Amino acid sequence: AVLKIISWNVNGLRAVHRKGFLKWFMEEKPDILCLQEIKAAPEQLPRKLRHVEGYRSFFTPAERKGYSGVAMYTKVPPSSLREGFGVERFDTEGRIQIADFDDFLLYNIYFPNGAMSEERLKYKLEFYDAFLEDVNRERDSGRNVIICGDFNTAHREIDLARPKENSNVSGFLPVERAWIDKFIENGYVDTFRMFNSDPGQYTWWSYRTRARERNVGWRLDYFFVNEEFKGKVKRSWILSDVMGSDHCPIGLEIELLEHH
Ligand SMILES: [Mg+2]
Structure with missing residues (x-):
């Protein structure tokens, strides 16, 4: 199930x-x-x-x-x-x-946008660090964790349409990408990339003429799990056809724990 x-x-x-x-x-x-x-x-x-x-x-x-x-x-x-x-x-x-569902904790997080100022980029990176301390505390206590939401950073060049032009803007700064590397190295898995290695997989497009139609987008929205829980992830997908926002929804199917 x-x-x-x-x-x-x-x-x-x-x-x-x-x-x-x-x-x-x-x-x-x-x-x-x-x-x-x-x-x-x-x-x-x-x-x-x-x-x-x-x-x-x-x-x-x-x-x-x-x-x-x-x-x-x-x-x-x-x-x-x-x-x-x-x-x-x-x-x-x-x-x-952070909702406790007994099988897992579910983090639903709107991570800060750091693009308007150095002030808010520093707040974003500090928020990232506080998040990592939090989830590690919960995971280390023995909980499985699912983390979803808008991380406001595209992890690698494949995760946005125009990487070279965005090297110096929040959303694709080396320091932001490096934080995602560190989060993963702490034992968490980007579930979309467990199943999909393709280009052009985005979840945000600027609200401007034909950007979405032309798929000029960024992957800003993710589902992560701790490593030990990844065998329970059965699907992780992008609902790219769903309109109504500058982001589209993303999905995860997680199998329920089966006690013996
Ligand atoms: Mg927004």
């Missing part, structure tokens, strides 16, 4: 609602849906977005109005939900959900 988990940066939950989000959600039927960039006060969402039949929903908004925010809809209730790393400046931006 498997669970289908989807991750999607929706570029505003109300915005994607107006384009057909609930119809997509009903057709795709994920067991767990992780969203990034909700951008809304949960009590200002229409009640048909706030609560969807068959799911429990959890919203973790930023302090700043209209900014960031993550959400999770799940057909099975988690046993707990942790919304921070325990560091105030990383925990007030609506970026972190």
